Design a protein around this ligand. Sequence first.
Ligand SMILES: Cc1ccc(NC(=O)c2cccc(C(F)(F)F)c2)cc1-n1cc2cnc(N)nc2[n+](C)c1=O
Length: 274
Amino acid sequence: GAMDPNYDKWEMERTDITMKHKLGGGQYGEVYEGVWKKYSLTVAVKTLKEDTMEVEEFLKEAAVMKEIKHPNLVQLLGVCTREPPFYIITEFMTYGNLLDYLRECNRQEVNAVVLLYMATQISSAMEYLEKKNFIHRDLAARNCLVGENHLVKVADFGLSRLMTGDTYTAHAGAKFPIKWTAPESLAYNKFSIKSDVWAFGVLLWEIATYGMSPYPGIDLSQVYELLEKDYRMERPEGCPEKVYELMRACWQWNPSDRPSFAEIHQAFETMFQE
Ligand SMILES: Cc1ccc(NC(=O)c2cccc(C(F)(F)F)c2)cc1-n1cc2cnc(N)nc2[n+](C)c1=O
């Protein structure tokens, strides 16, 4: 509605999108595969009709997505927050989440140099968020998406609500991904760009291991104590020593010592010969 107070270019007609069925990928809740009829365009449509403490948090999500734009950040297309069944319309990434992809991929195709390119793309998205003073809070393979040509977008699916298993452990109603969470976020509940950097190093290990769970075989209860004793994950099989040295950088105990995504990104840019 144009000539009306509080205009919004992101507001679209719910009528313009057909909803197929829920996106399968371990179910993201009320998130459907859609088609924007006019444009013959497949989209992802996050809805809401089961939560109601969410409603207000559903619209904070929408607002946040309006303020961010990067080629490696999942792209908002439109919202429907005018009438009851609210939509958040996003581009559709052909190959679902980055965790399953790495786990199910052909490794001849997703060869050494693809894995690095996927990593360079994420650091790019995060250098952007960093530039923007945006704290992501849940950087993990499960929150990334894979398009055509090994294209990786960083996203956020609200998975501490979805969780069925041992990835998000209960922590005062707040659910935490312990094995991705930095020590300061664990002990003192302080999140910042530098706590995203720590998560990044874990995600880099997820990528190099083709989607293996962090700290294999060790239980959650003893993760922090180990880190306190300066125990980090060891170099994955086949991983460059310069990629690993960067992992260890992100995993520095002191947050002020961890690289910026600026300097992580340039490291990937520099490394990008061959
Ligand atoms: C439908 C939807 C609506 C909103 C969002 N929002 C985010 O991913 C997001 C929310 C807040 C912040 C961020 C960011 F900081 F990481 F950019 C990202 C994602 C989606 N979304 C998108 C998908 C696109 N492609 C595919 N294959 N799956 C998708 N899923 C499961 C989604 O939830």
